[PDB]
Design a protein around this nucleic acid. Structure first.
Ligand SMILES: [K+]
Ligand SMILES: [K+]
Ligand SMILES: [K+]
Ligand SMILES: [K+]
Ligand SMILES: [K+]
Ligand SMILES: [K+]
Ligand SMILES: [K+]
Ligand SMILES: [K+]
Ligand SMILES: [K+]
Ligand SMILES: [K+]
Ligand SMILES: [K+]
Ligand SMILES: [K+]
Ligand SMILES: [K+]
Ligand SMILES: [K+]
Ligand SMILES: [K+]
Ligand SMILES: [K+]
Ligand SMILES: [K+]
Ligand SMILES: [K+]
Ligand SMILES: [K+]
Ligand SMILES: [K+]
Ligand SMILES: [K+]
Ligand SMILES: [K+]
Ligand SMILES: [K+]
Ligand SMILES: [K+]
Ligand SMILES: [K+]
Ligand SMILES: [K+]
Ligand SMILES: [K+]
Ligand SMILES: [K+]
Ligand SMILES: [K+]
Ligand SMILES: [K+]
Ligand SMILES: [K+]
Ligand SMILES: [K+]
Ligand SMILES: [K+]
Ligand SMILES: [K+]
Ligand SMILES: [K+]
Ligand SMILES: [K+]
Ligand SMILES: [K+]
Ligand SMILES: [K+]
Ligand SMILES: [K+]
Ligand SMILES: [K+]
Ligand SMILES: [K+]
Ligand SMILES: [K+]
Ligand SMILES: [K+]
Ligand SMILES: [K+]
Ligand SMILES: [K+]
Ligand SMILES: [K+]
Ligand SMILES: [K+]
Ligand SMILES: [K+]
Ligand SMILES: [K+]
Ligand SMILES: [K+]
Ligand SMILES: [K+]
Ligand SMILES: [K+]
Ligand SMILES: [K+]
Ligand SMILES: [K+]
Ligand SMILES: [K+]
Ligand SMILES: [K+]
Ligand SMILES: [Mg+2]
Ligand SMILES: [Mg+2]
Ligand SMILES: [Mg+2]
Ligand SMILES: [Mg+2]
Ligand SMILES: [Mg+2]
Ligand SMILES: [Mg+2]
Ligand SMILES: [Mg+2]
Ligand SMILES: [Mg+2]
Ligand SMILES: [Mg+2]
Ligand SMILES: [Mg+2]
Ligand SMILES: [Mg+2]
Ligand SMILES: [Mg+2]
Ligand SMILES: [Mg+2]
Ligand SMILES: [Mg+2]
Ligand SMILES: [Mg+2]
Ligand SMILES: [Mg+2]
Ligand SMILES: [Mg+2]
Ligand SMILES: [Mg+2]
Ligand SMILES: [Mg+2]
Ligand SMILES: [Mg+2]
Ligand SMILES: [Mg+2]
Ligand SMILES: [Mg+2]
Ligand SMILES: [Mg+2]
Ligand SMILES: [Mg+2]
Ligand SMILES: [Mg+2]
Ligand SMILES: [Mg+2]
Ligand SMILES: [Mg+2]
Ligand SMILES: [Mg+2]
Ligand SMILES: [Mg+2]
Ligand SMILES: [Mg+2]
Ligand SMILES: [Mg+2]
Ligand SMILES: [Mg+2]
Ligand SMILES: [Mg+2]
Ligand SMILES: [Mg+2]
Ligand SMILES: [Mg+2]
Ligand SMILES: [Mg+2]
Ligand SMILES: [Mg+2]
Lengths: 97, 50, 87
RNA sequence: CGCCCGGCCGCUCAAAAGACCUGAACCCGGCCGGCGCCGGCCCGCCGGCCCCGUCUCGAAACACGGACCGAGGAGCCA
RNA sequence: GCCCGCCGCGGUGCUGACGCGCAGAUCGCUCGUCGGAGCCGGGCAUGGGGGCGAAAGACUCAUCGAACCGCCUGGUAGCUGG
RNA sequence: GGCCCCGGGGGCGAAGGCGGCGCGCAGGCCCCGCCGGACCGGCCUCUGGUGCAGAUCUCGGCAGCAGUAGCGCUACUCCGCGCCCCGGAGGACUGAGGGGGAGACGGGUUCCGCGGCGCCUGCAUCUGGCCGCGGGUGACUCGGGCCUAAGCGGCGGGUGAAGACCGGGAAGGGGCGUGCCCGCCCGUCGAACGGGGAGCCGGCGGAGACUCCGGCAGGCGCGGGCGGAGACGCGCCCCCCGGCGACGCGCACGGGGACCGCGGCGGGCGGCGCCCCGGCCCGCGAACGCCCCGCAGCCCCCGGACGCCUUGCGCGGAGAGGGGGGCCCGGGGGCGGACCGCGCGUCCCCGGCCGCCCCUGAAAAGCCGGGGGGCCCGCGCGCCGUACCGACCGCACAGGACUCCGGGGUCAGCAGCCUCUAGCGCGGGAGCGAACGCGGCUCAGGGAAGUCGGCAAGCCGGCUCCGUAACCUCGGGAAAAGGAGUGGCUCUGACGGGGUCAGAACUGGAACGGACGCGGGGAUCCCGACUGUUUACUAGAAACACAGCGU
RNA sequence: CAACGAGGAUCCCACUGUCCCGAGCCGCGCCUCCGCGAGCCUCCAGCCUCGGGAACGGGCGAGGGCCGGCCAGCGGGGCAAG
RNA sequence: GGCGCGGCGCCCCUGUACGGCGAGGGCGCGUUCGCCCGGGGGGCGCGCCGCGGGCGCG
């Protein structure tokens, strides 16, 4: 009824954090009897224990805004915070030319 | 410290080993009523200067 | 900030264990004991503290050799052994 | 030993003396009675009564020390 | 030994909070400085009428117009208490 | 010290305790009842640490106050018998200078597994750094041992009443093999960040790993005279001359690695009222050995000059350019060990230059070269540290406490604000919605009349363009003062695949740095030239310092 | 004396709850409840007016008031505490 | 004082919902526009009705 040991041993076998290890709540009596990495490997086999994929951050809005920005959008004077020099240094332009 | 001389390790090792209760058969053998060993110490409130 | 905050800057050992007297009194930077005086050849003893004198002196330890010599003199055979030799 | 689910009852003992001899005061809980000192009367009326110790011409003082209780506590010796 | 500004280093005003504290000096906002006489860690040196001081009689382990510890010492009091 | 008439009172109940009569002017004494369970006295003579209400008395116990005052870090909820513990589902936070992952110092067993709630865990507990019982840290290659820094010891002796303190002027030791030869005189003290011979990948455990096991290597030891025109290429010992070890700061520019993105293609997911080849996850290759390739930079050969070349410079008759070569280069490739392209940046190291100083940026062990002279196969590698922690110091605690690694969006950005990975306490909860406080918000009309005093609060603020006075040590003043524009969408032009810069139409309460971040300004007088320093804990200044000047 | 200053002063523009003159709202404390649970202080006590008095009384002389027990608030007195 | 809970109507506040269909500077894409539409959402005020609303203590 205290499963701190199995949670720590499972994240070691699966190489993830303890925050993305999930037990099937049925079969909890099975998990309680496991004390070694070998008995934990059996449960990962019979699918009693699993790991979640990491959640990302969707880049669909980022990729659309960048697509619009190569068309000339979102880039007028109301959108600029740094000076012209900080945005495109005058020395970088001189050297290229 | 994780980097200690063998001489400090040995004196620390002895304070750990002698930090014990009176055995219960000793309490029956020597007919004692004081049962606490008052030379014990605990790491949170001690100042072993060793 | 000369009080509680200043005490949080302490992570040093001024004194360590003495090889002669065993106490937490050996100055690690001056290499001298503030209790027994080591590495001096004589022991540090002061008459302005007789309480410090009684804490570590003859008798506060085992007296292992001196005990045996006295009992041999008082009631054993040692006073006879001198007469054979001193003749 | 027994009975209920720690308690009760009771066992050892001259005695619980039961985590311990005796077990005072200050302070407190339960039952029962009643609504400060001195004096007269059997008894709640009438009469009298400022907080002690101290320094001081002078203290109830808006002068200082003192919540309460116990034990210790200061002219001896050469 | 330039200017705005982050961490860092400091400590202006609110005479704000707290003031039987979170704390025997702290917290919030505001503020000085930020390539330099800049800031930080370890080792080492200087010892009490002495040290050290961009100098405030400042600092020298919560102690400084003379540190701390034991002894001389039950120091002396024409003065307060009993 | 004595007496207490057959040798004083006592378990047939001593001393003490609690109540109650009596006697004495009083200090006090005597008796009775109950408690208690072993010792105690009246009279004469002797002796003293011999009598308490007080001293901010000392030590111990303890009342009212009073069930009172009180219990920073955004946050938990439902179900599982359910506790703040554990599981599942949801909702949030820390926000890569982390409430993340690890070391140094300090602590010392706090580490791990099983059990448990007496103490502690200021509420609870079935939780736990608490309590009981078992366990736990493996090295030729990592550090310590070695070297020396600033220092500190030692030194025939010297000095002082000594303790002790001070010190080169001393017949100062080695190689061997006898016997010759050579020789001026300390430290196996002082760094777990400096110097230093050599380690990488995969796997296994409840708690250890660059240490174990398997594999692949590396280091230090021990035993069985040629080629070239040239730059250059391919055993030892002593004396002397050298080298490596071995070194500051800086804006920039260049190269590599790692990270990070976009697109393809291969495998797997999610949700799906409409749309979706538009969302998410995974596609991995070390040390070491051999071959090739390496910009700058320095060198060789021919030959004899109005050029070569950098972002900047810089270079050449003391021999440029051009043609052909050599050496260095912490790197890359191919084969071993054993999925495919293209980009802007960020961090780290390296390169060649240039700038700066009345500042010029350690030493030694160890290892090597030169000149001169004399002459493949086996075995092994000892000693010590190694668990864990901000569990450390502040009497236990919003204080104090060195370093390393550092993703995405917005953006000038290591700022603010939101977030993937990882991690999840913070002396406890519920109800009500008074005064009053503490931290916040808004206010008609007026606008400092308030107050010692504009204290506090508010106005200003990003970026682009326009426009900027007095005075001045000519450098400044200066963001002086003041103005205007700024979103979304559809497009166009410029630069050699990449962002930026410029312009236009259309459109929306008459809006646009829409949150966040972010100067109010001006005219003067006094003091000190300026940056800097200070009363740790009531004084930051006009005080100290300073360059300059003078004695 | 240009430049510089968390240095001492006077004035103006702009700005505002500083003020005329205050009003409404948010969170957290307070408040009520379950659990937990202290400090300071205390001669004895705790209603006034006048007189006398160590010349400003809770108590003393004379008058006027007053069942007893408690809460949320508050700062006149207790010559309140330190 | 047999509560209230939850509805439907009225009346108010904001300012015309999502969607469907048909104008839009431009190059099937497109901010925005018009119409259904003083609409949709909301209510702590007013009016009338599905589940319900008279214990135990002195
Ligand atoms: K483009
Ligand atoms: K260790
Ligand atoms: K400790
Ligand atoms: K402090
Ligand atoms: K010493
Ligand atoms: K007095
Ligand atoms: K006096
Ligand atoms: K007098
Ligand atoms: K008196
Ligand atoms: K008086
Ligand atoms: K009084
Ligand atoms: K007096
Ligand atoms: K007084
Ligand atoms: K008094
Ligand atoms: K700062
Ligand atoms: K305030
Ligand atoms: K502070
Ligand atoms: K600056
Ligand atoms: K010193
Ligand atoms: K001194
Ligand atoms: K002294
Ligand atoms: K003393
Ligand atoms: K002395
Ligand atoms: K005197
Ligand atoms: K005196
Ligand atoms: K006194
Ligand atoms: K109280
Ligand atoms: K347990
Ligand atoms: K002498
Ligand atoms: K000397
Ligand atoms: K050293
Ligand atoms: K070091
Ligand atoms: K070292
Ligand atoms: K070096
Ligand atoms: K040579
Ligand atoms: K280890
Ligand atoms: K309330
Ligand atoms: K009030
Ligand atoms: K004014
Ligand atoms: K202000
Ligand atoms: K625009
Ligand atoms: K000054
Ligand atoms: K400066
Ligand atoms: K001050
Ligand atoms: K100051
Ligand atoms: K200042
Ligand atoms: K000063
Ligand atoms: K000037
Ligand atoms: K200044
Ligand atoms: K200054
Ligand atoms: K100033
Ligand atoms: K109000
Ligand atoms: K009077
Ligand atoms: K009076
Ligand atoms: K009085
Ligand atoms: K008064
Ligand atoms: Mg330029
Ligand atoms: Mg101090
Ligand atoms: Mg030191
Ligand atoms: Mg008893
Ligand atoms: Mg007097
Ligand atoms: Mg006095
Ligand atoms: Mg008093
Ligand atoms: Mg007494
Ligand atoms: Mg500066
Ligand atoms: Mg600045
Ligand atoms: Mg204040
Ligand atoms: Mg004295
Ligand atoms: Mg004295
Ligand atoms: Mg006596
Ligand atoms: Mg006495
Ligand atoms: Mg007394
Ligand atoms: Mg957040
Ligand atoms: Mg544990
Ligand atoms: Mg508790
Ligand atoms: Mg090594
Ligand atoms: Mg050494
Ligand atoms: Mg090193
Ligand atoms: Mg580990
Ligand atoms: Mg160096
Ligand atoms: Mg470790
Ligand atoms: Mg107004
Ligand atoms: Mg005025
Ligand atoms: Mg006025
Ligand atoms: Mg100045
Ligand atoms: Mg300054
Ligand atoms: Mg101060
Ligand atoms: Mg100050
Ligand atoms: Mg008003
Ligand atoms: Mg009074
Ligand atoms: Mg009276
Ligand atoms: Mg008052
Ligand atoms: Mg419409």
């Amino acid at each position: 009824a205290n499963l701190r040991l199995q949670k720590r041993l499972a994240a070691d076998v699966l190489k993830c954090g303890k925050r993305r290890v999930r037990f099937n709540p049925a079969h909890e009596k099975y998990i309680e009897q496991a004390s070694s990495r070998e008995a934990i490997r059996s449960l990962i086999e019979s699918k009693i224990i699993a790991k979640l994929d990491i959640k990302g951050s969707s880049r669909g809005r980022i990729r659309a805004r960048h697509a619009a920005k190569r068309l000339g959008r979102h880039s007028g004077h109301g959108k600029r915070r740094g000076t012209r020099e900080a945005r495109m240094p005058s020395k970088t332009l001189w050297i290229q030319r | 410290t994780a980097n200690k001389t063998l001489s400090r390790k040995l004196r620390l090792a002895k304070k750990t080993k002698t930090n014990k209760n009176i055995p219960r058969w000793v309490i029956a053998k020597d007919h004692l009523k004081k049962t606490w060993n008052y030379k014990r110490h605990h790491w949170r409130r001690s100042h072993l200067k060793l | 900030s000369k009080g509680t905050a200043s005490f949080g800057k302490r992570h040093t050992r001024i004194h360590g264990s003495c090889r002669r007297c065993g106490k937490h009194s050996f100055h690690l930077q001056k290499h001298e004991c503030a209790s027994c005086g080591y590495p001096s050849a004589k022991m540090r003893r002061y008459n302005w503290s007789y309480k410090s004198l009684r804490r570590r002196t003859q008798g506060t330890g085992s007296m292992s050799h001196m005990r045996k010599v006295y009992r041999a003199y008082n009631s054993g055979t040692l006073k006879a052994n001198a007469r054979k030799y001193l003749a």
